[PDB]
Structure 1
Amino acid sequence: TRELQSLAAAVVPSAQTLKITDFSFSDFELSDLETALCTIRMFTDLNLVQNFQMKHEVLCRWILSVKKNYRKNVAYHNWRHAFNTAQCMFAALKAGKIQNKLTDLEILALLIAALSHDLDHRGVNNSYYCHSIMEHHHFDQCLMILNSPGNQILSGLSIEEYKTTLKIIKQAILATDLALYIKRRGEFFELIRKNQFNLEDPHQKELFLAMLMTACDLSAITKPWPIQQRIAELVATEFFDQGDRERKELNIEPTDLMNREKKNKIPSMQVGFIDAICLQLYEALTHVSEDCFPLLDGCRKNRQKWQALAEQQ
């Protein structure tokens, strides 16, 4: 492919040339091809290619696949969301002094995983339990790939390696279903308020890693007003287009969050979100590794721009 060859025989800059190491980083400027070089870098400055000796040409045949297997039709749940979640994954990892808490497996899972937490989205979301169906279609799609020929970045691990990682990847993706993350967090939100925390304990390694996956899913909510707002207008575009669709085939009305109107109350809906989900998920996180404040803060900096906009309704 005149695509793989290219990204193959190019030059993956660096964690610095690419500034992929900051909570303030955005996809906005660089072209897709580049969001490939970065990602490739991601694996690289993460030790994934070297330990698991990933074939250069396949990390790229994978990614490209991973990418092209995304729709630029949806207005948020597009490749640029996965990239921006792998990034925010790749940063709370380094500049967050979090990496030092995970194994080299759980780190391959989270990169591979995180670049697939929403693999084949179509624009069908919620607002409040479904047992994570949309999520198995993502994993089943995740796996569909990793197994694919010429895109097998795990074809270097061992039976108990490929297992232990598919157990994280899966359990990982399936954790982007806020439902679970809400029918859980409530507890992982006391290991803190009782400090009895501990990552050596498996279960807690679960609750953590999860609360971490969503933390990055919502990555864009703690981004510089520019980068952040520029995105909420995208998720908005989608949330509204989903109402429009479900008022054509079906004949239901919209749940505010999704009606092309109520656009004036979008703030308090953004505000409510943060207070209902964002805030505590990030502050609490912080306590794990204080090098995460950049998020919990960017958040509070945004939940004061909404409280502003909203104080005009």
Structure 2
Amino acid sequence: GLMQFTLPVRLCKEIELFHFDIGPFENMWPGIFVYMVHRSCGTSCFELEKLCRFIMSVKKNYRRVPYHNWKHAVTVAHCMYAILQNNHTLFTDLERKGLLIACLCHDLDHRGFSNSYLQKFDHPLAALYSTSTMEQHHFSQTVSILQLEGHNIFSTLSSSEYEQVLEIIRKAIIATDLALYFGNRKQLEEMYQTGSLNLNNQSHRDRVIGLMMTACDLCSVTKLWPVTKLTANDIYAEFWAEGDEMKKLGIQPIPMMDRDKKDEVPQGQLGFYNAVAIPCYTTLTQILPPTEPLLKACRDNLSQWEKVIRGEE
């Protein structure tokens, strides 16, 4: 009850900033997450023993893949922490509880393969979940872990509050399917510009939480350049392995996943910043002005990729 988590001075200060990197010491990431739950939600939100047991079972159910790993889970949770702390009064008690957990769990048991590869492989999961295949699995794994003995961090919630938080988590995790992002952002852009956006409309809140989830999930593009550049290596390490597996199924992969086309990576990053990242943080900044630093950092990284193409690095 009177047991706060406290980080070293540099981490205590920089964890508040959007571009914070959680560092290479894996053993500190549980502590960093609990610290973030305590400050963004409260020391009362969760039973500490149950939370710690929940966190360590979530960690165990992330795989040793180059990018879609435990470090990604905690990184995405930190971006959500920064959004919530910069938007104090906008979010309900249940939303602050659910969204940090949603981010920690959003890629549970990821194999480093796209929905697309599962469909072409004819993976069992593609027959169980026809759309948003991996994201329905991530939600299923979250519910599984919540139902383990001593792992029910929501035990103090009423039956209707429990159903509400699990619905926040389900929608937040489904929203991380980038295929759904494009339509969600277009709808949010129209609602904001025609002035019909209403944060008391539950279907509108759902859309806004969806965009927050895309923003947190893509947040590697909002780090300082050296973090962004090195994270790109891990992202493409997965993409190229999927491309290899596409070639094993006798299917030429998209260039993004073809290691023979490494040379086109800089131009591929430009397309991604212009088609996905910048539009994402732009719309997020219009709806939630204090998230502007994410847009600024994204624009800084776009400029760095433009420099790579011009041979200035």
For normalisation by structure 1, the TM-score amounts to 0.89
One-letter amino acid of the structure 1 residue matched with residue 102 of structure 2: A
- The equivalences for 1:134-213 within 5 A come to 134-213=134-213
The range that moved more, 158-167 or 144-153, is: 144-153
Q: Match of 1:71? A: 63
Out of 100, 125, 150, the position equivalent to 2:114 is: 125
C-alpha distance 256-309 of structure 1, shift in aligned 2 (>3 A) = same
Q: Match of 2:17? A: 22
Offset, 1:225: 0.4
Q: Secondary structure at the match of 1:187?
A: helix
Note the alpha carbon deviations across 1:48-93, whole angstroms, 9 max, x for none: 441x3x2211110110111111112x11000110100000010011
Equivalent pair of 2:54/2:151 in contact (CA under 8 Å): yes
Structure 2 residue ranges without an equivalent (≥5) = 120-129
Q: Percent of pairs identical after alignment?
A: 39
One-letter amino acid of the structure 2 residue matched with residue 110 of structure 1: L
Q: Match of 2:92? A: 103
Q: Match of 1:47? A: 41
Backbone CA RMSD of aligned residues: 2.1
Q: Match of 1:4? A: none
Offset, 1:312: 4.5
- The equivalences for 1:245-256 within 5 A come to 245-248=245-248, 250-256=249-255
Offset, 1:245: 2.2
One-letter amino acid of the structure 2 residue matched with residue 22 of structure 1: L
Q: Match of 1:5? A: none
Structure 1 residue ranges without an equivalent (≥5) = 1-9
Equivalent pair of 1:11/1:37 in contact (CA under 8 Å): no
Q: Does 1:82 align with 2:82?
A: no
Note the alpha carbon deviations across 1:210-264, whole angstroms, 9 max, x for none: 011111000111111011111011101110111112223x122221100112111
The range that moved more, 34-43 or 184-193, is: 184-193
- The equivalences for 1:231-246 within 5 A come to 231-246=231-246
Equivalent pair of 1:75/1:237 in contact (CA under 8 Å): yes
Distance in 2 between residues matched to 1:126 and 1:305, nearest whole Å: 30
Distance in 2 between residues matched to 1:189 and 1:108, nearest whole Å: 27
Note the alpha carbon deviations across 1:154-174, whole angstroms, 9 max, x for none: 111110111000111001100
Equivalent pair of 1:279/1:300 in contact (CA under 8 Å): yes
Equivalent pair of 1:239/1:258 in contact (CA under 8 Å): yes
Equivalent pair of 1:61/1:150 in contact (CA under 8 Å): yes
Higher helix share: 2
One-letter amino acid of the structure 2 residue matched with residue 289 of structure 1: L
Equivalent pair of 1:27/1:35 in contact (CA under 8 Å): yes
